[PDB]
Amino acid sequence: HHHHHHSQELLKDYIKRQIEYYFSVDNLERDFFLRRKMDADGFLPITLIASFHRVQALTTDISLIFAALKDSKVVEIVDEKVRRREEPEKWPLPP
RNA sequence: UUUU
């Protein structure tokens, strides 16, 4: 009972900014590991993003990660997966 | 092994 909605708002903002960095053009131009994990439509499992060190440092609460991304104009969520909103299909690469 |  030490968990409170108000005391996760800043954490959500740090998570949102971190994940928006992964899906930035600047990062995607060099992030071959991430692109090699994408499906042909650009989607990645949100749980894969949650495992990355800078996200995992901030939280292991998957609801907070989902909430942080509903707040984003950079990414699109469908069910368990997330992709860049703009031209996602340009980025996938063979595994 | 990773600002994957």
Which residue pairs, CB below 8 angstroms and at least 24 apart, start in A87-92? Answer: A88/A38, A88/A41, A88/A42, A88/A43, A89/A40, A89/A41, A89/A42, A91/A28, A91/A35, A91/A38, A91/A42, A92/A35, A92/A38, A92/A39, A92/A40, A92/A41, A92/A42
Nucleotides of B under 7 A from a protein CB: 2-4
Spanning CA of A53 to C1' of B1, the rounded length in angstroms is: 11
Q: Which nucleotide is nearest to A48 (CA to C1')?
A: B4
At A33, the amino acid letter reads: F
CA distance A70 to A6: 17
C-beta separation of A72 from A19 below 8 A: yes
Solved with: X-ray
Q: How many domains does chain A have?
A: 1
Resolution in A: 1.3
CA distance A89 to A1: 43
Residues 6+ away with beta carbon under 8 Å from A59 = A11, A15, A65
Phi/psi of residue A48, nearest 5 degrees: -65, -45
| CA A2 to chain CA centroid, nearest Å | 26
**What is the C-alpha R_g of chain A?**
13
Phi/psi of residue A28, nearest 5 degrees: -60, -30
Q: Which nucleotide is nearest to A21 (CA to C1')?
A: B3
Which residues, in sequence order, are bridge partners of residue A82?
A44, A77
Domain that includes residue A21, residue range: 1-95
